[PDB]
């Protein structure tokens, strides 16, 4: 396993709302001059997400383990390249197929193995006194990788990272969704220019590359980088700088937006179909111009809460010893009818003696027996052979 830090000042984060962000292309079909609806995972407008911080020239560096849900909207405002890669898995202990997509300064290591992570994985760089670049020295991601299922190596590229401080310069948004075997990644770059806060602009995210793999993602964790200059000792005690960045963590919800396609085919406007009474009218009428009148929408329904059961109290068990697994029964033409009533009947206790080999219920579901009440349960006991079981069916001659 990797190492950890010492004395982490975790400040209570704040909460921010969305500003028309989290809209992408649900399908790969070109559509223009058409207004309709699409049922897909998106981020609802004017929601409430957790706003994390990482400003440090204190000791603001927090990266908890958040559970992964169906559709996670991640928007990081990197002005000096602090947030590197991300991890996806369940227990993170070399016991399941985990996803490791780290944005290394040399290449993009995308491997699906069984890595071993510590308590707080991160990246470590060094600031040389003679070289003004930002090269990577420490590598505290994993420890070993034996069984693997996928490996991807990017092309060699030269990237000396960024040192810009003050205001934000680049915006990197990533959407991670787990749909069966397709892992869609929507990456979109937008050169923003502001101090802080989420921009109020509207843009459509484009997919990068789909990974047809079969992994089980339950929890994720955002990995960052630490700066170690010559003024700091460079140890894992107090000689480390968190940096200066901020990322937004949001979860997608099954909503429905009103996509607007112009002559170029890009998404320029999105109106929610279930949030405000005014925005719902635009989606229902399939038009952005609402006239002055009266309209009819949904009705009024109340969902129930508890569920009471009113069954008669019966403290008697039906004799399953003489009916099932006995000594002898009757013939096929002289079968005897036994009345079974005034007792509690159940089919789950019929496996302790004489395991059944053919249990096919006709006219009733085998799992819906205990749901409905039984009344006048007659048993037809007869001993036959195996060549006559196929003929016993309601509708055979």
């Amino acid at each position: 396993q990797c190492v950890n830090l010492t004395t982490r000042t975790q400040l209570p984060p704040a909460y921010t709302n969305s500003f028309t962000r989290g809209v992408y292309y649900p399908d790969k079909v070109f559509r223009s001059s058409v207004l309709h609806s699409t049922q897909d995972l998106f981020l609802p407008f004017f929601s409430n997400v957790t706003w994390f911080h990482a400003i440090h020239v204190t000791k603001r560096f927090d990266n908890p383990v958040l559970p992964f849900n169906d559709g996670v909207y991640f928007a990081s405002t990197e002005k000096s390249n602090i947030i590197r890669g991300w991890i996806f898995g369940t227990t993170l202990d070399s016991k399941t197929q985990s996803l490791l997509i780290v944005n290394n300064a040399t290449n993009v290591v995308i491997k699906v193995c069984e890595f071993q992570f510590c308590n707080d994985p991160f990246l470590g760089v060094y600031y040389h006194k003679n070289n003004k670049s930002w090269m990577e020295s420490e590598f505290r991601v994993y420890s070993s990788a034996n069984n693997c299922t996928f490996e991807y190596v990017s092309q060699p590229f030269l990237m000396d990272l960024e040192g810009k401080q003050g205001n934000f310069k680049n915006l990197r948004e990533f959407v991670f969704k787990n749909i069966d075997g397709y892992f869609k990644i929507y990456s979109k770059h937008t050169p923003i220019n502001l101090v802080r806060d989420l921009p109020q602009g509207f843009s459509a995210l484009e997919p990068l590359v789909d990974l047809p793999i079969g992994i089980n993602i339950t929890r994720f964790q955002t990995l960052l980088a630490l700066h170690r200059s010559y003024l700091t000792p460079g140890d894992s005690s107090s000689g480390w700088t968190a940096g200066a960045a901020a990322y937004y963590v949001g979860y997608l919800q099954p909503r429905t937006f009103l996509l607007k396609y112009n002559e170029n085919g890009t998404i320029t406007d999105a109106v929610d179909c279930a949030l405000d009474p005014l925005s719902e009218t635009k989606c229902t009428l399939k038009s952005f111009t609402v006239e002055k009148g009266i309209y009819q929408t949904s009705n009024f329904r109340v969902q129930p809460t508890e569920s009471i059961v009113r069954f008669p109290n019966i403290t008697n068990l039906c004799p399953f010893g003489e009916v099932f697994n006995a000594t002898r029964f009757a013939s096929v033409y002289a079968w005897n009818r036994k009345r079974i009533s005034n007792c509690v009947a159940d089919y789950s206790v019929l496996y302790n003696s004489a395991s059944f080999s053919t249990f096919k219920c006709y006219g009733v579901s085998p799992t819906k027996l205990n749901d409905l009440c039984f009344t006048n349960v007659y048993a037809d006991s007869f001993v036959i052979r195996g060549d006559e079981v196929r003929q016993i069916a309601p509708g055979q001659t």
Binding site: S298, F300, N313, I314, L369
Partner: protein
Amino acid sequence: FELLHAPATVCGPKKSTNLVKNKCVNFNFNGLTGTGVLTESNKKFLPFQQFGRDIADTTDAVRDPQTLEILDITPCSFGGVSVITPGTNTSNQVAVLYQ
């Protein structure tokens, strides 16, 4: 075996539940599961029946197999929602009308 043709006497190994009246919860009388408010009843009932259907062939009254009382069935799904707006070119104020 039959399904909904005679008073209960067997059923399954399911336990009981405390009666919660004046609520729009899910009830279950003699296997029949429905949804409605178990209000009071002031009408007459023959001392040898169980269920009770009206003109619309709906479950009206039903005798409890434990407390032995008549309780009516009335679903709480009664209402309508309608929004009236003067238009998006005048003001962004709406008025939710409850029918």
